[PDB]
Amino acid sequence: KVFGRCELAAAMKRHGLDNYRGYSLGNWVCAAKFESNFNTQATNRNTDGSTDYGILQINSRWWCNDGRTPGSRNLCNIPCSALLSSDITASVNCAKKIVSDGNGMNAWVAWRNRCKGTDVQAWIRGCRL
Ligand SMILES: [Cl-]
Ligand SMILES: [Cl-]
Ligand code: NA
């Protein structure tokens, strides 16, 4: 599924991401935009053989099992394919564990490089929340 901007904001707000660990809704929408272009089916292979999955590009080395990342952990206890569903619930629940692990949203390289320190509220402007 390819979300619209306001549609995704509404879905994320309902799943409890607005101000989760102090990160306002605009941060999560901005990160999803630049990680996946709002596409729940996005995948990208990394140089170490791990793969990033889904709307928030969650990585198989630490967070989910895809059966081909040797010596990886499965800290969210999910198959990585669950992160590609049109229902973002699995992605959101796993992202909550990532953002709580100490490094906040710096875990997402695109957030660090393209959202951090910008006017992230612009990403939810005009949406009916
Ligand atoms: Cl915001
Ligand atoms: Cl933080
Ligand atoms: Na894994």
Swiss-Prot record:
EC number: 3.2.1.17
Broad class of where this protein is predominantly found: secreted
Single GO MF descriptor: lysozyme activity
SUPFAM superfamilies: Lysozyme-like
Active site: 35, 52
Record localization: Secreted
Binding, substrate: 101
Tissues expressing the protein: In the egg white and polymorphonuclear leukocytes.
CDD domains: LYZ_C
Keyword Hydrolase: yes
Family assignment from sequence similarity: Belongs to the glycosyl hydrolase 22 family.
Function: Lysozymes have primarily a bacteriolytic function; those in tissues and body fluids are associated with the monocyte-macrophage system and enhance the activity of immunoagents. Has bacteriolytic activity against M.luteus.
Protein name: Lysozyme C
Organism the protein comes from: Gallus gallus
Gene: LYZ
